[PDB]
């Protein structure tokens, strides 16, 4: 099976886009070919769970890319050896850590280095980060940086592709919960529509 790790923070852990992506995989005829991997397996009870849903993920509410890069990622990828890694991180670096864009892209680099050390053929999706309701400018600065980072980092052996979940790709405030940070059902549909097709293409590419 193709092993996929859905790495992230609360936007991965406590949201419902992962079931939608699994549905897409199912619809593509790939549910028997795909194993979602990771240390966590919680899903909120208000999400519409497809039957057969693979609940494993590597989402952690409140965790920062800074910390994950330095303390956790090597363990997680060493334990699971994913073929594909999809992530959105950085929201807590800003809102909790008060870190800048240079910090966050640096932490990206350290995470990707660890993913590749575990698997030099890993295929990676980096998500441009959803906006906060208040259009946090350091989040946008990370988003403006992601394409250059990808250009610097992507290789034929280990491609890095972008799932653009940003303001600029259509993420509206109407897609946020009342806390101004997490996607509501509309934002989950949007997220799943950006990630799911890139993830399906990568799955198909895995040898």
Ligand X SMILES: CCCCCCCCO[C@@H]1O[C@H](CO)[C@@H](O)[C@H](O)[C@H]1O
Token pair 């494993």 is found at 56
Contact pattern for Ca ion over residues 45 through 84, marking x by CB under 5 A: ---------x-x----------------------------
54 is in an annotated binding site: yes
Which phi and psi (to 5°) does residue 101 adopt?
Answer: -65, -40
Encoded tokens for 73: 């990622």
Could you say which of 17, 36, 63, 149 contacts Ca ion (CB under 5 A)? 36
Contact flag: residue 133 with ligand SO3 (CB under 6 A): no
CA 144 to CA 52: how far, in whole Å? 37
185 interacts with, out of ligand X, ligand SO3, Ca ion, none, CB within 5 to 8 A per kind: ligand SO3
Contact flag: residue 14 with ligand X (CB under 6 A): yes
Q: At what angle do helices 185-205 and 17-27 cross, to 10 degrees?
A: 40
Binding footprint of Ca ion, residue count (CB under 5 A): 4
From the CB of 120, what's the least distance to Ca ion, in Å? 23
* 111 close to 71: Cβ distance less than 8 angstroms: no
Which range of residues in 97-105, 129-137, 182-190, 197-205 is near ligand SO3 by CB under 6 A? 182-190
56 is in an annotated binding site: yes
From the CB of 196, what's the least distance to ligand X, in Å? 20
DSSP state of 206: -
Q: Which is nearer to ligand SO3, 87 or 190 (CB)?
A: 190
Cα torsion for 152, 138, 6, 45, to the nearest 10°?
-170
Which residues have CB under 8 Å from 113's CB, separation 6+?
none
CA 22 to CA 171: how far, in whole Å? 21
Contact flag: residue 185 with ligand X (CB under 6 A): no
Question: Which residues bind to ligand SO3, rule: CB under 6 A?
Answer: 184-186
Question: Which residues bind to Ca ion, rule: CB under 5 A?
Answer: 35-36, 54, 56
């Amino acid at each position: 099976m193709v092993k996929v790790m859905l790495l992230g923070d609360s936007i991965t852990e406590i949201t419902c886009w992962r079931p939608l992506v699994w549905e897409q995989i199912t619809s593509a005829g790939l549910a028997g070919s795909v194993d979602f991997v990771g240390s966590m397996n919680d899903l909120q009870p208000n999400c519409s769970r497809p039957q057969g849903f693979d609940p494993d993920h590597e989402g952690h509410s409140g965790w920062q890319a800074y910390d994950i890069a330095r303390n956790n990622i090597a363990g997680w990828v060493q334990n699971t050896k994913p073929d594909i890694v999809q992530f959105m991180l950085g929201t807590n670096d800003v809102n909790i850590g008060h870190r800048n864009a240079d910090s966050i892209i640096g932490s990206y680099t350290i995470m990707l280095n660890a993913m590749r050390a575990a698997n030099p053929r890993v295929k990676v999706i980096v998500d441009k980060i959803i906006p906060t309701s208040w259009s946090d400018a350091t989040i946008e600065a990370v988003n403006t940086a992601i394409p250059g980072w990808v250009q610097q980092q992507t290789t034929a052996e280990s491609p890095v592709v972008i799932a653009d979940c940003s303001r600029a790709a259509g993420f509206t405030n109407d897609m946020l919960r009342d806390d101004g940070v997490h996607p509501n059902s509309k934002g989950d549909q949007f997220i799943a529509g950006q990630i799911g097709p890139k993830l399906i293409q990568l799955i198909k590419d895995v040898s």
